[PDB]
């Protein structure tokens, strides 16, 4: 009977309005996780920035060269993750 189907079909819709609901949770969960990782890497680079912020004074430039040269490796990671976070938004 066509009337009978009208109630079952709408029921099967309800399973996906929650299934799709769960999918969005996973997507947004990754976005939060990806966001957090970015802070840690810049914080480490930030720490090296303070560490390099204590050497170039009183003429110890040679020490500053190595300190900032190490920061460059961390800096690249920050840029890569920064673009990804914006795209995922």
């Amino acid at each position: 009977a066509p009337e009978d189907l009208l109630e079952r079909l709408l029921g099967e819709m309800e399973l996906e309005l929650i299934e799709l609901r769960r999918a969005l949770a996973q997507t947004i969960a990754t976005f939060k996780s990806t966001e957090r990782q970015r802070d840690a890497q810049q914080l480490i680079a930030q720490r090296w920035y303070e560490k390099a912020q204590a050497a170039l004074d009183r003429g110890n430039e040679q020490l500053a060269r190595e300190a900032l040269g190490q920061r460059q490796s961390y800096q690249s990671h920050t840029e890569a993750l920064g673009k990804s976070l914006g795209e995922q938004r």
Partner: protein
């Protein structure tokens, strides 16, 4: 040199692993969304309300 060289391989490879792991969830998530939000519109086709092939 060998111990220094071999460690570099592990460090580079280890980073590539977690990078792959993160992408796995994202593509899977888009698939379910590309299937869940995908699987509804067809049954609405049976209730099209826009043609003469629907129950409505």
């Amino acid at each position: 040199a060998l111990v220094e060289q071999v460690r570099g391989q592990l460090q580079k490879l280890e980073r590539k692993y977690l990078e792959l792991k993160s992408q796995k969830n994202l593509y899977l998530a888009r698939l379910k969304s590309a299937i869940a939000a995908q699987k509804i519109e067809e049954i609405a086709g049976n209730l099209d309300n826009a043609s003469a092939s629907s129950l409505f």
